[PDB]
Amino acid sequence: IDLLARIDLEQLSYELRHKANTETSKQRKTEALKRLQVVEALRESQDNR
DNA sequence: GTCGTTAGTTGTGGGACTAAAGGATATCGTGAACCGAAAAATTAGTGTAACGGGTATCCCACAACGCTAG
């Protein structure tokens, strides 16, 4: 609860895009984009409700 | 010589498997003793009859004419 409350979705998404853009490993990039999917899904949810 | 990377396994985990009818199941093992709770049953106590007028209603019966003289 505390960790997810302290989370910042916009900053987290920007950090993940940066990490994907500056990573020399394909697997790390895949993990970064996979987390970005869920982060952006939550961001899109926060617009409707 | 040593460290990160990539691709191809390899083991492991989560998700599918016509339609129609019908549709009954049986379900162990035991430790004691006292207190409290409320739900139930048993027991103890009080009682009328006709009368005066006057009047409201009911049922029950009957009436509600015809002629003659001053």
mmCIF file of C-alpha atoms (C1' of nucleotides) in Angstrom:
data_model
loop_
_atom_site.group_PDB
_atom_site.id
_atom_site.type_symbol
_atom_site.label_atom_id
_atom_site.label_comp_id
_atom_site.label_asym_id
_atom_site.label_seq_id
_atom_site.Cartn_x
_atom_site.Cartn_y
_atom_site.Cartn_z
ATOM 1 C CA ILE A 1 0.000 0.000 0.000
ATOM 2 C CA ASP A 2 2.710 2.479 0.990
ATOM 3 C CA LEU A 3 4.917 1.706 -2.017
ATOM 4 C CA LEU A 4 2.078 1.977 -4.539
ATOM 5 C CA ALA A 5 0.841 5.185 -2.905
ATOM 6 C CA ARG A 6 4.271 6.826 -3.073
ATOM 7 C CA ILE A 7 4.530 5.823 -6.748
ATOM 8 C CA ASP A 8 4.475 8.524 -9.439
ATOM 9 C CA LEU A 9 3.151 7.172 -12.723
ATOM 10 C CA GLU A 10 4.410 9.937 -15.029
ATOM 11 C CA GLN A 11 7.922 9.926 -13.577
ATOM 12 C CA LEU A 12 7.984 6.122 -13.587
ATOM 13 C CA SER A 13 6.930 6.024 -17.246
ATOM 14 C CA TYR A 14 9.578 8.565 -18.250
ATOM 15 C CA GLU A 15 12.237 6.651 -16.305
ATOM 16 C CA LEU A 16 11.240 3.398 -17.999
ATOM 17 C CA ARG A 17 11.338 5.000 -21.454
ATOM 18 C CA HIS A 18 14.810 6.341 -20.646
ATOM 19 C CA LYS A 19 15.942 2.917 -19.423
ATOM 20 C CA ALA A 20 14.643 1.248 -22.584
ATOM 21 C CA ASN A 21 16.295 3.881 -24.787
ATOM 22 C CA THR A 22 19.699 3.537 -23.088
ATOM 23 C CA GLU A 23 20.089 -0.202 -22.440
ATOM 24 C CA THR A 24 22.550 -2.526 -24.176
ATOM 25 C CA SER A 25 20.616 -5.693 -23.235
ATOM 26 C CA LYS A 26 17.611 -6.960 -25.181
ATOM 27 C CA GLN A 27 16.132 -8.755 -22.161
ATOM 28 C CA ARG A 28 16.401 -5.678 -19.934
ATOM 29 C CA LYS A 29 14.737 -3.622 -22.673
ATOM 30 C CA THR A 30 11.947 -6.194 -22.942
ATOM 31 C CA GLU A 31 11.373 -6.069 -19.181
ATOM 32 C CA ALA A 32 11.378 -2.263 -19.237
ATOM 33 C CA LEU A 33 8.792 -2.117 -22.016
ATOM 34 C CA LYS A 34 6.671 -4.804 -20.349
ATOM 35 C CA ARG A 35 6.496 -2.725 -17.166
ATOM 36 C CA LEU A 36 5.832 0.360 -19.305
ATOM 37 C CA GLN A 37 2.759 -1.376 -20.735
ATOM 38 C CA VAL A 38 1.125 -1.664 -17.307
ATOM 39 C CA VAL A 39 2.254 1.804 -16.218
ATOM 40 C CA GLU A 40 0.729 3.398 -19.315
ATOM 41 C CA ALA A 41 -2.423 1.302 -18.906
ATOM 42 C CA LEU A 42 -2.856 2.782 -15.429
ATOM 43 C CA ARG A 43 -2.149 6.264 -16.789
ATOM 44 C CA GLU A 44 -4.819 5.803 -19.464
ATOM 45 C CA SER A 45 -7.240 4.519 -16.822
ATOM 46 C CA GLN A 46 -6.673 7.652 -14.742
ATOM 47 C CA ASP A 47 -8.066 9.805 -17.571
ATOM 48 C CA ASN A 48 -11.543 8.245 -17.777
ATOM 49 C CA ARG A 49 -12.020 7.889 -14.006
ATOM 50 C "C1'" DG B 1 42.071 -14.276 -19.019
ATOM 51 C "C1'" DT B 2 37.588 -12.431 -17.814
ATOM 52 C "C1'" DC B 3 32.812 -10.420 -18.066
ATOM 53 C "C1'" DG B 4 28.262 -9.239 -20.366
ATOM 54 C "C1'" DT B 5 25.061 -10.852 -24.413
ATOM 55 C "C1'" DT B 6 22.295 -13.518 -27.387
ATOM 56 C "C1'" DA B 7 19.892 -17.396 -29.016
ATOM 57 C "C1'" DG B 8 18.244 -21.857 -28.364
ATOM 58 C "C1'" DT B 9 16.802 -25.041 -25.451
ATOM 59 C "C1'" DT B 10 14.540 -27.070 -20.969
ATOM 60 C "C1'" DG B 11 11.592 -27.381 -17.106
ATOM 61 C "C1'" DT B 12 7.576 -25.575 -15.294
ATOM 62 C "C1'" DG B 13 3.065 -23.209 -14.970
ATOM 63 C "C1'" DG B 14 -1.632 -21.645 -16.611
ATOM 64 C "C1'" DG B 15 -5.659 -22.497 -19.873
ATOM 65 C "C1'" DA B 16 -9.065 -24.931 -23.570
ATOM 66 C "C1'" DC B 17 -11.702 -29.671 -24.284
ATOM 67 C "C1'" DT B 18 -20.454 -29.934 -29.058
ATOM 68 C "C1'" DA B 19 -25.206 -29.717 -28.304
ATOM 69 C "C1'" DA B 20 -30.534 -32.103 -25.920
ATOM 70 C "C1'" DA B 21 -31.999 -34.892 -21.265
ATOM 71 C "C1'" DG B 22 -31.278 -35.876 -15.866
ATOM 72 C "C1'" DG B 23 -29.803 -34.630 -11.347
ATOM 73 C "C1'" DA B 24 -30.395 -40.295 -5.957
ATOM 74 C "C1'" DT B 25 -26.160 -40.548 -2.721
ATOM 75 C "C1'" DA B 26 -22.742 -40.234 3.120
ATOM 76 C "C1'" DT B 27 -20.326 -38.126 5.754
ATOM 77 C "C1'" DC B 28 -15.393 -41.575 12.762
ATOM 78 C "C1'" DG B 29 -12.389 -40.417 16.623
ATOM 79 C "C1'" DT B 30 -15.270 -37.737 23.379
ATOM 80 C "C1'" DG B 31 -12.510 -34.630 28.861
ATOM 81 C "C1'" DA B 32 -14.805 -33.096 33.435
ATOM 82 C "C1'" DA B 33 -17.074 -29.966 36.273
ATOM 83 C "C1'" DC B 34 -19.473 -25.760 37.812
ATOM 84 C "C1'" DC B 35 -21.885 -21.463 36.883
ATOM 85 C "C1'" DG B 36 -24.955 -18.587 34.450
ATOM 86 C "C1'" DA B 37 -28.821 -17.673 31.538
ATOM 87 C "C1'" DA B 38 -33.691 -17.376 30.355
ATOM 88 C "C1'" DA B 39 -37.651 -19.764 29.352
ATOM 89 C "C1'" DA B 40 -41.286 -22.021 31.299
ATOM 90 C "C1'" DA B 41 -45.337 -23.256 34.996
ATOM 91 C "C1'" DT B 42 -47.553 -22.731 39.088
ATOM 92 C "C1'" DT B 43 -50.045 -20.045 42.253
ATOM 93 C "C1'" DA B 44 -52.981 -16.004 44.364
ATOM 94 C "C1'" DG B 45 -56.675 -12.881 44.016
ATOM 95 C "C1'" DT B 46 -62.541 -10.813 43.036
ATOM 96 C "C1'" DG B 47 -68.527 -11.895 42.441
ATOM 97 C "C1'" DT B 48 -75.798 -8.617 41.069
ATOM 98 C "C1'" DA B 49 -81.263 -7.628 40.471
ATOM 99 C "C1'" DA B 50 -85.006 -4.596 40.002
ATOM 100 C "C1'" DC B 51 -86.531 -0.471 40.378
ATOM 101 C "C1'" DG B 52 -89.512 5.403 39.197
ATOM 102 C "C1'" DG B 53 -90.809 8.106 35.098
ATOM 103 C "C1'" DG B 54 -89.988 8.913 30.137
ATOM 104 C "C1'" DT B 55 -89.026 7.676 25.657
ATOM 105 C "C1'" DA B 56 -86.322 5.384 21.351
ATOM 106 C "C1'" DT B 57 -87.438 1.212 18.564
ATOM 107 C "C1'" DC B 58 -89.907 -3.432 17.209
ATOM 108 C "C1'" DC B 59 -94.453 -6.656 15.988
ATOM 109 C "C1'" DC B 60 -99.476 -6.752 15.522
ATOM 110 C "C1'" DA B 61 -104.320 -5.337 14.720
ATOM 111 C "C1'" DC B 62 -107.625 -1.933 12.972
ATOM 112 C "C1'" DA B 63 -109.505 2.407 10.483
ATOM 113 C "C1'" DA B 64 -109.724 5.654 6.935
ATOM 114 C "C1'" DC B 65 -119.361 5.970 7.331
ATOM 115 C "C1'" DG B 66 -123.466 7.069 5.387
ATOM 116 C "C1'" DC B 67 -128.081 9.353 6.036
ATOM 117 C "C1'" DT B 68 -131.690 12.967 7.793
ATOM 118 C "C1'" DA B 69 -133.315 17.161 9.678
ATOM 119 C "C1'" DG B 70 -133.048 22.356 11.146
#
